Specification:
homodimer; mainly alpha; Apoptosis Regulator Bcl-x; binds zinc ion; apoptosis; dimer
Chain lengths: ~160, ~160
């Protein structure tokens, strides 16, 4: 019975954990061809917590289902400028488009995936210290766009461990 | 009878307008010794709107009452690093401290003033495209820390035109 508030708070850990494990997965799948981002290795993590577990499962299942959203995110970000303002504008546009026709778990994973790709792009183009900002983009968007409320209604982030 | 939501939305314009007029004021008071930030000149503005008027009044009255908060902000920011993460951490710490003992209009102006100084510091140390991010720091903090709710309870941002 996680409240909307609690779900909204949980998203920070879910996203950090998703980023960490997705990046570990990419390193496993790509080896030396994996895009480097040490920020994604050293971020705060609590692996055995529930939300740590959830982000990790979302990273594993996204490897399969998020493939097509990803391949585009990767093409369509190539053109983004590394300022905070461009980042935010681009984030808001894509995230709004993702949810225009409603919310489902696959689109939740897609948003996390987009956050991941956005954060990695801006880092590669020299904007350091911005991973926390993308996490904030995600947490806040999920809260104000009633994604947190939706999740809470499905049983909380813990409901994702079943996917 | 502006709702909490509406007040929260209004803060964007109030802050942009405050920044614009405060920066114009600084240029008037300091001339060539005024710190340069063209971002503060070219930001979106609607001068005859209510919130445009409110930000402008807050800029004028802050010139007198915010002097001592400011002089410190100016010293205490000198040490801040121009990453988004440092910015956010420093913003959150100071803004939380400002409101620890409650909310009043002078502390509202102080927060806008801090936003102003933070935005100008990071710009001067080379972080461009970050003014919108500081505006977002302000808007969101006011909403989640029940400042918007407080203002709404006082009659909305329009209640400030009397100060
Ligand atoms: Zn928010």
């Amino acid at each position: 019975s996680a409240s909307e508030e609690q779900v909204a708070q949980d998203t920070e850990e879910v996203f950090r954990s998703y980023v960490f494990y997705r990046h570990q997965q990419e390193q496993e799948a790509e080896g030396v061809a994996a895009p480097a981002d040490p920020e994604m290795v050293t971020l705060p993590l609590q692996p055995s917590s529930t939300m740590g577990q959830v982000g990790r499962q979302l990273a594993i299942i996204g490897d399969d289902i998020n493939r097509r959203y990803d391949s585009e995110f990767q093409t369509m970000l190539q053109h983004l400028q590394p300022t905070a303002e461009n980042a935010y504008e681009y984030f808001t546009k894509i995230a709004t488009s993702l949810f225009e026709s409603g919310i489902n778990w696959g689109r939740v994973v897609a948003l996390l995936g987009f956050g991941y790709r956005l954060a990695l792009h801006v880092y590669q183009h020299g904007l350091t210290g911005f991973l926390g900002q993308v996490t904030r983009f995600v947490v806040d968007f999920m809260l104000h766009h009633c994604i947190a409320r939706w999740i809470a209604q499905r049983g909380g982030w813990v409901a994702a461990l079943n996917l």
